[PDB]
Symmetry: C2
Subunit: 72 residues, 2 copies
């Protein structure tokens, strides 16, 4: 389980931006942003341990609090 769900994304948050933000924690291998805009994203890590360490956290991306959960 190396994919996380990222809730409360804003529309200006691009895949590049999310990847740049999330790769601070470990290698990111994919980002999925729904189209049309649905205010969430999925971020996939190479390492399971990295994804699990983020679950349950609320992180600040460009001043916005996003919630991290397991991807199902």
């Amino acid at each position: 389980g190396s994919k996380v769900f990222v809730g409360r994304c804003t529309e200006d948050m691009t895949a590049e931006e999310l990847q740049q933000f999330f790769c601070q924690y470990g290698e990111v291998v994919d980002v999925f942003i729904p189209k049309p805009f649905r205010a969430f994203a999925f971020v996939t890590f190479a390492d399971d341990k990295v994804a699990q360490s983020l679950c349950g956290e609320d992180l600040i991306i460009k001043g916005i609090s996003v919630h991290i959960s397991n991807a199902e």
Copy 2:
């Protein structure tokens, strides 16, 4: 401003544990835990950028959500 306040600490959270947890983000140079127990701590980073990136986040340490704020 390279020091953060860590709110909602639990008593079992030792200085070593907090340092181990927080050094994932960057070099940690000090940890202060009040005695007697007051359910918060201060963590000092070598790098200001690291402290600022954490402010406003809620992080999970041993299953517990702690809130990160600027140290004043």
